[PDB]
Specification:
This protein has 7 helices and no strands. By secondary structure, it is mostly helical. α3 packs antiparallel against α4.
Length: 90
Amino acid sequence: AKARDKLEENRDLIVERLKVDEIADFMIEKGELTEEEKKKVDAEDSERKRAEKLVEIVMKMDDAAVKAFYDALKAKGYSDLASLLESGLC
C-alpha cells in the first residue's frame, strides 16, 4: 500500500528511462514476469510505450511483482529510479 503508490506517482520519470528488456528478463528469473507478457510488452512501437505497458502489468499483479521490479532497477543500475519507490515497501 506504499510502493504501489510511489510507483504510480513517479510513473512518468520511470517510463522515460526504462530499457524494458533488462528489467523484463530480471523479473522473469524471479518468477514475476512471463516470456509471453514479455513479447506483448515488446509489441508496442516506441520505447516509452513498452515501458508503459510493463508498469501496467506490475500495477496489476501482487506486491511480489512490484518487489521484483524494485530489485530489477537496483540490479540493472537504476539506482535513483529505485530510490523513488522506497519510503514505504510493501
